Amino acid sequence: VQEDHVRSSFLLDNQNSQNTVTASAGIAFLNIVNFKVETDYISQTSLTKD
Amino acid sequence: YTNCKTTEDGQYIIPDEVYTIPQKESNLEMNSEVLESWMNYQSTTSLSIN
């Protein structure tokens, strides 16, 4: 009388988020013929769990 | 060991003051498992102005 059990379990996760923020300027004809401002911002987050 | 006996499935020599009654087998294997894995990511800013 022989027997056996197998019980595999496989649970995987992922949370791959992102951000991208940009600003701008460019007030330039009068009292200052030119000055320009722009910022950039990018953020990532990738978290896997198995 | 006078009338020297032997087990029925003759592969031993019991002494003649004992008798045998043959049977068995039994075993059992079992094991387990555990894994993991994690990750992460980044962020960035930049501004080039004037």
Author numbering:
A (entry chain H): 216 to 265
B (entry chain I): 67 to 116
What does the paper say about this structure?
Perforin-2 (MPEG1) is thought to enable the killing of invading microbes engulfed by macrophages and other phagocytes, forming pores in their membranes. Perforin-2 (PFN2) has recently been identified as a novel and critically important component of innate immunity conserved throughout the animal kingdom and evolutionarily close to the last common ancestor of the MAC and perforin-1 (7, 10). Because of the presence of a canonical MAC-perforin (MACPF) domain, PFN2 has been proposed to form functional pores in bacterial membranes, leading to bacterial death and control of infection. However, unlike MAC components and perforin-1, PFN2 is initially synthesized as a type I transmembrane protein and found associated with the membranes of intracellular vesicles in which its large ectodomain (consisting mainly of the MACPF domain and a unique P2 domain characteristic of PFN2) projects into the lumen.
A complete (180°) reconfiguration of the MACPF and membrane-binding P2 domains triggered by acidification then results in pore formation. We were able to construct a model of the pore fitted to its cryo-EM density guided by the distinctive features of each PFN2 domain and their connectivity and the conserved two glycans visible in both structures. We were unable to resolve the CTT domain due to the absence of density for the CTT in the PFN2 pore map, suggesting that it may have become intrinsically disordered on pore formation. Our structure confirms the rotation between the MACPF and P2 domains by 180° and reveals other conformational changes accompanying membrane insertion including the deployment of TMH1 and TMH2 to generate a 64-stranded β-barrel. In the pore form, the MACPF domain has rotated with respect to the P2 domain by ~180° when viewed from the side and by ~90° when viewed from above (looking down toward the membrane surface) compared to its position in the pre-pore, resulting in a compound screw rotation. The pore-forming oligomer structure is entirely consistent with the pores imaged directly on liposome membranes and is 206 Å in diameter and 140 Å tall from the top of the MACPF domain to the tip of the β-barrel. Side views of membrane-inserted pores were very different from those of pre-pores, with obvious transmembrane channels and standing significantly taller than the pre-pore form (110 Å compared to 85 Å). Upon exposure to a low pH shock, the PFN2 pre-pore rings began to form pores after 14 s and all ~70 being imaged transited to the pore state within 3 s. The resulting structures were higher (raised by ~4 nm) compared to the pre-pore state, in agreement with the pores imaged by negative-stain electron microscopy. Overall, these results show that acidic pH triggers pre-pore–to–pore transformation, which is achieved by a 180° rotation of the MACPF and P2 domains with respect to each other so that membrane insertion can occur.
